[PDB]
Amino acid sequence: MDVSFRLSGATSSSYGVFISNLRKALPYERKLYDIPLLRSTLPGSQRYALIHLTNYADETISVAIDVTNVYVMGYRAGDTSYFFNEASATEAAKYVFKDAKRKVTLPYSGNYERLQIAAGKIRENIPLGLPALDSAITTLFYYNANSAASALMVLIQSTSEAARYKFIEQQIGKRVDKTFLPSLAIISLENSWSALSKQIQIASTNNGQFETPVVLINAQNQRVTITNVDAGVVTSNIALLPNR
Ligand code: NA
DSSP: OOOOESSTOOOOHHHHHHHHHHHHTTTTEETTTTEEEESSOGGGGSSSEEEEEOTTTOOEEHHHEEETTOOOEEEEEEEEEESSHHHHHHTTTTSSTTOEEEEEEOOOOOSHHHHHHHTTTTGGSOOOOOHHHHHHHHHHHHHHHHHHHHHHHHHHHHIIIHHHHHHHHHHHHHOOSSOOOHHHHHHHHHHHHHHHHHHHHHHHHTOOOEEEEEEEEEETTOOEEEETTSSSSHHHTTTTTTOO
């Protein structure tokens, strides 16, 4: 269940090893098109995994993930736990970080629309890359509440979204000593994970064909309609599928 990443001495390779270990920490039913399909039901003792992240200043947070969908439920810093204001995280708080002296319910839920409203900033204007992840860890470790929502969006994209997509893992891991604003291609992948996952599952009993087309933006900023499992996003990008 545990997976660790250290920012001190991080490389593109060490980030890749971390994201592979995160994918490998999640139990799978089987593969569809060589993509792991996550479990629909687990023993409670197996339902949540912890990611330990340590920044350049040697400050560690532990992040709780739901292994059936890679959603971040909350995090711990020292003797405080912090959970999203959402029923899924209230359930998680029964299993993880129970020994923390103080449990905080964050003001907001974990979805990007509420995170962006809380931050007063959209993902397209928040730098990613390994240095951005280092700053995000600092903010969360101290719970600097005015920067926490932005930090959580860095943290989620650098963990949950990188685990879901090779293209995101690759783009974030390439920025070792710099930052970058995420392209519409990265945003589009995050926004469409749920819909694409559903259509890949449908496709497997439907001769490879989607029931419902999915619109993405590609790396040239073009709108593309996805209708089958031969799309590059299905053959050479997406890395995990949730069960409905
Ligand atoms: Na803010």
